[PDB]
A paper describes a structure:
Each head domain (hd) can be subdivided into a “RecA”-like lobe that contains the ATP-binding pocket and a “helical” lobe that merges into the coiled coils; they connect the heads to a half-doughnut-shaped “hinge” dimerization domain. Smc2hd and Smc4hd are furthermore connected by their binding to opposite ends of the Brn1Cnd2/NCAPH kleisin subunit (Onn et al., 2007).
As expected, both structures revealed canonical two-lobed SMC [name] folds that display a high degree of evolutionary surface conservation at their ATP-binding and head dimerization interfaces. Although included in the crystallization construct, crystals of the Ct Smc2hd domain showed no electron density for the N-terminal Brn1 region, which presumably dissociated during crystallization (see below). A comparison of the nucleotide-free Ct Smc2hd and Smc4hd–Brn1C structures of condensin to the adenosine 5′-[γ-thio]triphosphate (ATPγS)-bound Saccharomyces cerevisiae (Sc) Smc1hd-Scc1C and Smc3hd-Scc1N structures of cohesin or to bacterial SMC [name] head structures revealed differences in the orientations of the helical lobes and attached coiled coils relative to the RecA lobes, which can be explained by flexion movements of ∼25° or ∼15°, respectively. These motions displace strictly conserved glutamine residues in the [name] and Smc4 Q loops, which are thought to coordinate the catalytic Mg2+ ion and contribute to nucleotide binding. In contrast, even the wild-type (WT) version of Ct Smc2hd-Brn1N was unable to bind ATP. The [name] head fails to bind ATP on its own, presumably because of the deformation of the [name] P loop observed in two different crystal forms, but readily binds and hydrolyses ATP when in complex with the Smc4 head.
Residue numbers in the entry: 1 to 51, 61 to 220, 983 to 1177
The structure:
């Protein structure tokens, strides 16, 4: 499902009921540097999705407005991507409301719904509200640029799905820990408790036969502890074989983990360089282990600016660093896909041509997903199919909808 309509009423700078309609299925751009209305559109979308709420009302809500409502209207004609249990609806609308005191209620298609129902709806179409895989904000770019090689790898390990192997390896390690401990309990009991009692007992019997009393049950005590020895010694050789079996299992786990990480590394590395080449024509990039280490020890971003390999991301300009981090983020979207993606103010250091390159990539390489790009600066992302310009007029934010190529 994709967005077709956004209705904001009494929410933040939208004092009056405001309907923003005609959202494109592929590439939308929300602009408006001055004022708060442009960013308020994103806050309204995040509010319905579920990312002191009385402050979100028009005046918190000390002035006239005392109720706030936001409604997202989804097109649901593509039944293949329809949320399960809602296939009959050609259109699904989710509404969230605020009243004084900051309590909220949800509506689905005009009928009251539980919050869990709305959350289960969004997560059924891979809009992970709890861990947003669809929200690319400026902080994510800054975070990626400062990631150490171990953290870059962790990003790749997640896409490879190697937690599968790591959970198994953690189980076997707890198992082999109990096995290892068992031999220590055996060796303590055997060497320090069973073997001394047995040789002392054989010594008493060896004092008695020599030319007086011996314990009548000495024959039995000998045979009793002699059996306990043969049982412990065989357990030694058995628990060790279990320990060997776990080691061979873990090595097979690590091998399949390494091979799965290798396939994901090559897939990401290929897309990452091509995406960066599209966003910054004439340049290239790759993920490579740091000088001297291995894949298991982490991955590192190497950038070729023009014909020059750069030693550090530190050496890149502001715009080049944003494009490098955005290229890596976009190269990983395929592993946790979403029907909708939101790009929030990543264009501070960018030129117009860079935003045009991002826009072309959205319409082609990422065709099949709906992109909403909230621009920071005006006049960016001009090749968007639908552009919503926010201004402020008569105490409320007003949105002008445009369709380039008229």
């Amino acid at each position: 499902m994709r967005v077709t309509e956004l209705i904001i009423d009494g929410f933040k700078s939208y004092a009056v009921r405001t309907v923003i309609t005609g959202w494109d299925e592929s590439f939308n751009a929300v602009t408006g540097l001055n004022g708060s209305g442009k960013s308020n559109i994103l806050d309204a979308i995040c509010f319905v999705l579920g990312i002191n709420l009385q402050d979100l009302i028009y005046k918190r809500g000390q002035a006239g407005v005392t109720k706030a409502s936001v409604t997202i209207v989804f097109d649901n004609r593509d039944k293949k991507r329809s949320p399960i249990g809602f296939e009959e609806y050609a259109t699904i609308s989710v509404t969230r409301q605020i009243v004084l005191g900051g309590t909220t209620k949800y509506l689905i298609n005009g009928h009251r719904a539980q919050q869990q129902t709305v959350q289960n709806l969004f997560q059924s179409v891979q809009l992970n509200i709890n861990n947003p895989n669809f929200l690319i904000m400026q902080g994510r770019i800054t975070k990626v640029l400062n990631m150490k090689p171990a953290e870059i790898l962790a990003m790749i390990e997640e896409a490879a799905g190697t937690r599968m192997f790591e959970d198994r390896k953690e189980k076997a390690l707890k198992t082999m820990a109990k096995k290892d401990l068992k031999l220590q309990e055996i060796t303590e009991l055997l060497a320090d408790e069973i073997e001394p009692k047995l040789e002392k007992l054989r010594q008493e019997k060896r004092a008695f036969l020599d030319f007086k009393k011996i314990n009548p049950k000495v024959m039995n005590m000998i045979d009793s502890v002699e059996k306990k020895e043969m049982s412990l010694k065989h357990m030694m050789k058995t628990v060790l074989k279990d320990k060997h079996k776990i080691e061979e299992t873990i090595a097979t786990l690590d091998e399949y983990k390494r091979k799965a990480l290798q396939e994901t590394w090559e897939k990401v590395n290929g897309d990452f360089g091509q995406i960066f080449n599209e966003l910054l024509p004439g340049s290239f990039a790759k993920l490579e282990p740091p000088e001297g280490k291995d894949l298991t020890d982490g991955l590192e971003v190497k950038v070729r600016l023009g014909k020059v390999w750069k030693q550090s991301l530190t050496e890149l300009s502001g715009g080049q660093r944003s494009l490098i981090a955005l290229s890596l983020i976009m190269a990983l979207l395929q592993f946790k896909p979403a029907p909708m993606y939101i790009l929030d103010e990543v264009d501070a250091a960018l030129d117009l041509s860079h935003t045009q390159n991002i826009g072309r990539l959205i319409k082609t390489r990422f065709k099949g997903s709906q992109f909403i790009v909230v621009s920071l600066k005006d006049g960016m992302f001009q090749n968007a199919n639908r552009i919503f310009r926010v201004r402020f007029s008569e105490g409320t934010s007003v949105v002008q909808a445009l369709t380039p190529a008229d």
